[PDB]
């Protein structure tokens, strides 16, 4: 069983190799069986069919290989179900935190991988095997017209240099230069969690999903106080936001203010956050493409188009966001793929 | 009548020089007499009396130098006052929006003045005559250890190059190369709007002080997410910020955690991603003096030494964090130095 798994502050990220070019045992048949006849597993858990890569060879063996998440708040019963029926190479802040749970299972051998190394391997083996046949990274074509505005294939054959934004609970940044050359560039605490917390206190909203829905519903402009609030118009144009929530200081449009509109201000808040540190490190560190990742983009078309329209339109076109779409997984699969070392 | 006037989003600064080296008119010495007589006007409007200036001698005139506030929001009263009781240099996004509005003033001559020159030029000009023979600017000397940590004066003899950052309703980044040589770097929207609005949606409170109050009061730990949340410990802190309000995103946190707590994360977060955004500009800009004006941080200690630390911090001791005396005015005061050019 070859698996990599990238246990997380909010998500655990799985990915799987299945050989399909196979007198075993049976409980080994009956988890190949349980993942592949299965697309959720328990309540919370569920596997990205869509993102599954078929027939890669992958030490010399012919195989699928699998992208599974669940909230790391349901690793103990992953756990649990571990112990009734091994090596691990897992990656992520759980794979220490949560080490001497995993060794419960007796026998089983938990390799801690360098969270740095995982994604950037992850990052570059994905993209250099393709989706198959396709384009692992897009970007957003014309990215400041809506009418123009469309996903498109973008190729890294030779991927440096790389800025990598990494948006899980807080976010983290990578400028990677060549192969064994990549540095922790810096990080905010303003990420996914940021925006799903805060959604939650002011919406009540109680999913990622739920509140991503809220937000599409919803004008922002109703709670953010804009260049034109405090000017009467228009090298900022009056559109643009000059304070996040700064129209809830007023008593009254606290009050007329929906959840929606407050949904959409806590999603624009974060991205556009995200996006302003992400021009300034790309500056900082001179490199041109920026490839964000996470979970925090997956299925939020909104904030990749916030964030692929604030480089463009900040940076006079200079800067490129850059997604991928097994951008929450390149850590599992990095420690999967470091299997072989032992 | 000497007057200059910074209109914000959010707060009008007034700075009004005084003359005391003096039949005139009658109602030139009721406004001279109502200034100086009171502290407070009408139910909004203050006058910070510890940061006058005393005996200065400007425009060939000796005087004193009063500093006073009252919302944007009550402007319309001021004005109204003012019609029924000039030439008035203004500056801030309010000077263009309410450009009419104060035409309504018979015969009264509005100067609106570049925001920019108006701050760098009163920023250079209260540093160069001093607090009264004290210091305008300090530092906090030990700014990561609190036994050690207080506050000291710092000089600004040659104040170049100089990274100005203005926390007002949003957060203006300003480079200051030189007296002629300065630019706008970049700015976010997340500032002292995004503090309040947040802050008063999520406690319910009715002023920057009760919500600095509430804050004081608070554990900011208990919303946000930790890196030993994560890690289970420890180049990052186990007691780092890892997701701001990270924590919210789970329904048994959301109702356990106080006003007070969540008053306290806000500030936390604000201020620490205005501490990043900041370090980050002055990487790209080369400069390791950051000076922060604006009235987020007036009477608001936490948040000085939140950035203290965290530019001492991150940079190693190479970035120091600056603060002024007169944060808050020096718009107003820049405008009023522009009077002898009409
Ligand atoms: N089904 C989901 N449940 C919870 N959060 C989701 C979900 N889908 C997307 N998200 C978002 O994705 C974010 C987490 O992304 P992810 O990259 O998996 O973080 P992580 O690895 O768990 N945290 P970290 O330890 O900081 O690296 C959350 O903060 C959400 O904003
Ligand atoms: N008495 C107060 N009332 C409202 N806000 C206050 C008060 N005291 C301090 N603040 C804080 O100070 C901030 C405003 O600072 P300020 O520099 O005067 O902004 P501004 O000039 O009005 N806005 P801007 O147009 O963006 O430059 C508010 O966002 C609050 O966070
Ligand atoms: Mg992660
Ligand atoms: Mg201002």
Redesign the pocket.
């Known amino acids: 069983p070859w698996f990599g798994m990238?246990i997380?502050?909010?998500?655990v990220?799985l990915s799987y190799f299945e050989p399909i070019d196979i007198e075993e045992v049976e409980s080994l048949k009956s988890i190949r069986k349980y993942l592949t006849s299965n697309v959720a597993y328990g309540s919370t858990g569920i596997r990205d069919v869509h993102l599954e890569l078929k027939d890669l060879t992958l030490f010399g063996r012919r195989g699928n290989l699998h992208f599974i998440r669940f909230?790391?708040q349901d690793l103990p019963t992953f756990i649990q179900m571990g112990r009734d029926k091994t090596v691990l190479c897992a990656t992520?802040?759980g794979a220490y935190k949560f080490e001497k749970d995993f060794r419960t299972i007796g026998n089983l051998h938990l390799h801690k991988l360098d969270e740095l190394d995982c994604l950037v391997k992850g990052l570059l083996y994905i993209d250099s095997v393709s989706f198959n046949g396709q384009a692992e990274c897009y970007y957003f074509a014309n990215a400041s017209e809506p009418e123009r505005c469309q996903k498109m294939p973008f190729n890294l054959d030779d991927p440096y240099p790389l800025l990598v934004v990494?948006?899980?609970?807080?976010v983290?940044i990578l400028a990677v230069h060549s192969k064994d050359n990549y540095k922790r560039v810096t990080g905010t605490s303003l990420?996914?969690?940021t925006?799903?917390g805060l959604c939650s206190l002011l919406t009540g909203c109680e999913?990622?999903?739920e509140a991503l829905e809220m937000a599409s519903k919803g004008d922002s402009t109703q709670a953010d106080k804009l260049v034109r609030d405090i000017y009467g118009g228009d090298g900022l144009p009056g559109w643009a936001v000059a304070s996040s929530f700064g129209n809830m200081i007023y008593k009254e449009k606290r009050e007329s203010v929906s959840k929606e509109d407050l949904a959409r201000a806590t999603l624009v808040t974060i991205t556009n956050n995200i996006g302003s540190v992400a021009r300034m490190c790309a500056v900082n560190e001179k490199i041109n493409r920026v490839v964000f990742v996470?979970?925090?983009l997956?299925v939020n078309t909104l904030s990749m188009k916030l964030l692929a329209y604030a480089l463009d339109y900040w940076s006079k076109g200079q800067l490129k966001a850059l997604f991928l779409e097994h951008e929450?997984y390149f850590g599992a699969v990095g420690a999967l793929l470091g299997l072989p070392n032992f």
Chains 1, 2 share one sequence.
């Open positions: 990238d997380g502050g909010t998500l990220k909230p790391t992520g802040g990494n948006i899980g609970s807080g983290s990420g996914g969690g925006f799903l999913s990622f999903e996470g979970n925090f997956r929450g």
